[PDB]
């Protein structure tokens, strides 16, 4: 069973799309641990969608990737970044494209934080 | 569930023809009345195909004397002697719950020939 993360299902989908795309550009983000655990499976599924490289997988990925600029002074979108860099980087590796490393609790609410990175 | 598959592979009924959930066919049902076992024919359109291997069931609906009769059989039962497909219908979905209120030509215009 998946987590609800205290959000509405539409808010869950929007926050997961935002975190997935933001991980895809910035390559290392710092969230809470349960958000990391919910995010990593979706991110490796989208990397698996990028592995195929065909038009139908790209149109599947376009329904999830938000339209933010990936690489500056190149006009590269994130959707181009999945099919240009991440898929060619993880061609040999079969799964496990992300790892989660825990940090200490947050000051304001005691939230256990985690580092997410593409490996 | 592969152990359940290995248990029930010996009792699968493999001589039955493949049929979609939107065509009409006749079912040869062996019934025991005492002592002779007549085989009554149940012609009608398939409504359901709910999977599960040995737990697969299919539902056949017909209109008899102005009252619609829905009858559901398991797929691999030995009570069914023979299944013949009368004609293949063209449908858009696997569950045909809509046509049990569409008497009478409104079901005929949906169950067209394929």
């Amino acid at each position: 069973s998946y987590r609800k993360l205290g959000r509405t299902s539409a808010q869950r989908k929007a926050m997961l799309r935002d975190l997935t795309t933001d991980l895809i550009i910035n390559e290392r983000i710092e969230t809470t641990e349960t958000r990391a655990k919910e995010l990593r499976s979706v991110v490796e599924k989208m990397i698996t969608l990028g592995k195929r490289g065909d038009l139908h997988a790209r149109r599947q990925a376009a329904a999830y990737i938000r339209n933010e600029v990936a690489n500056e002074e190149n006009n590269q979108d994130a959707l181009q970044k999945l099919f240009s860099d991440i898929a060619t980087r993880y061609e040999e590796r079969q799964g496990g494209y992300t790892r989660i490393m825990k940090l200490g609790p947050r000051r304001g609410d005691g939230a256990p934080m985690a580092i997410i990175e593409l490996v | 569930q592969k152990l359940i598959e290995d248990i029930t592979k010996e009792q699968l009924r493999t001589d039955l023809p493949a049929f979609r959930p939107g065509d009409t066919l006749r079912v040869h049902v062996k019934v025991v009345e005492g002592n002779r076992e007549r085989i009554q024919i149940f012609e009608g359109v398939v409504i359901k195909r709910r999977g599960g291997g040995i737990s697969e069931t299919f539902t056949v609906r017909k209109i008899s004397y102005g009252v619609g009769v829905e009858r559901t059989f398991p797929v691999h039962t030995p009570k069914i002697a023979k299944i013949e497909v009368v004609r293949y219908g063209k449908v858009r979905r696997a569950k045909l719950y809509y046509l049990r209120e569409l008497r009478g030509k409104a079901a005929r215009i949906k169950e067209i020939r394929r």
């Binding site: 490393m101 825990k102 940090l103 200490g104 580092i115 | -």
Partner: protein
Amino acid sequence: AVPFRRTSKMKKRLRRTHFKLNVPGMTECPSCGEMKLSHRVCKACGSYNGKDIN
């Protein structure tokens, strides 16, 4: 939903027996220390088994 009698000091202290909190799972960091809680990145050196990953 109204307290009939006030709680005495001894009953209050007996109820506050389990209100204490435990020592965290803190261990020696192999890079510098000291010290580092288990299954988390060290806040001092930023290392974890054993690369400096920050």
